[PDB]
Design a protein around this ligand. Structure first.
Ligand SMILES: *[C@@H]1O[C@H](CO)[C@@H](O)[C@H](O)[C@H]1NC(C)=O
Lengths: 51, 51
């Protein structure tokens, strides 16, 4: 049930961010995918709105 | 074709054996096997699909 998709690196802790949804997706493995071991990579994504 | 990234559902390779043989037959279809297989020059309908 972990919905806190914030690995102490996202910029969601701001006053100008607004409303959003902490989501996540899957990635690929390999040298071109960013790792050196065949395994599904945890890739987090965050979207919001601005004015 | 290693795991951890490759995806297959089921029933893509068959097994056959009579007496300690365990022979495997091929069932995967190539690209030039399905119907409606066109080429680089295509004139289906009014559109002329070029490259
Ligand atoms: C090939 O195209 C025809 C005409 O559009 C269609 O009737 C037929 O179902 C198609 N074949 C396949 C395998 O989709």
């Amino acid at each position: 049930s972990t919905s806190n998709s914030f690995s102490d690196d996202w910029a969601g802790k701001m006053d100008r961010a607004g409303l959003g949804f902490s989501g996540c997706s899957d990635g690929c493995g390999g040298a071109a995918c960013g790792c050196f071991n065949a395994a599904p990579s945890c890739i987090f994504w965050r979207k919001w709105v601005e004015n | 074709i290693k795991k951890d990234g490759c995806i297959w559902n089921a029933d893509l390779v068959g097994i056959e054996l009579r007496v300690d043989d365990a022979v495997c037959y091929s069932k995967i279809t190539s690209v030039e096997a399905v119907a409606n297989y066109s080429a680089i020059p295509t004139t289906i309908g009014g559109l002329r699909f070029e490259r």
